[PDB]
Amino acid sequence: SYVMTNEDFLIQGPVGQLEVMITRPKGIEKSVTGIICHPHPLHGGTMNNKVVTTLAKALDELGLKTVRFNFRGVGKSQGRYDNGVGEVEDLKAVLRWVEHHWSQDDIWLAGFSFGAYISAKVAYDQKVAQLISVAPPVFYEGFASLTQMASPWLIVQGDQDEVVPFEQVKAFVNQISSPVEFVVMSGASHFFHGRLIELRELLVRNLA
Ligand code: NA
Ligand code: NA
């Protein structure tokens, strides 16, 4: 499907255009596409966030096309913040767009913090081949109900994350019924400053 690679472009979202960028892998391209959601739009989170980039690099290394996008209101994406509700619809729109362009592909959903919540919400509604959360903000009220996730779920978490505390994520992983692959980076903060190479390696190791 003719879609320019490694450049920002716009697609139709629920409330306006969504800014998207895709990548295509450098070797065998698997019939799996990963969509990666960014951290909190109200705290400067965008599709260009470095943890988002790292997730994309990991998925690319694994042979997946990747799709990153800005939630409504962010960057060139039109509209305004919608309480985590419309943001779910934004991801759902990007997901439909992926399914339209690559109908044969399985889907991976991934996200960092706010984006981990949004992607988990969608993966709870539509079983996908793999869900990936980095620093899922499990204190969000909307996380409480995500107890029987059908999609396989990898959670990567720094144990020195002060924004999303390890013990809270651990407790969430413990309380939910469905199995989670819970991978912890020792000494990593919420932002993985200087640990992005290791984060990529950790993702690849656990997703290969
Ligand atoms: Na966030
Ligand atoms: Na905007």
From TrEMBL:
Would I find Lipoprotein among this entry's keywords?
no
Give the matching Pfam families: Abhydrolase_1
Looking up InterPro entries in the UniProt record yields: AB_hydrolase_1, AB_hydrolase_fold
Keywords, comma-separated and alphabetical = Hydrolase
One example GO MF annotation: hydrolase activity
Using the record's annotation, list all stretches that form the AB hydrolase-1 domain. 42-136
Check the record and name the PANTHER family matching this protein: AB HYDROLASE-1 DOMAIN-CONTAINING PROTEIN (PTHR42103:SF2), ALPHA/BETA-HYDROLASES SUPERFAMILY PROTEIN (PTHR42103)
Put simply, this protein is called Alpha/beta hydrolase
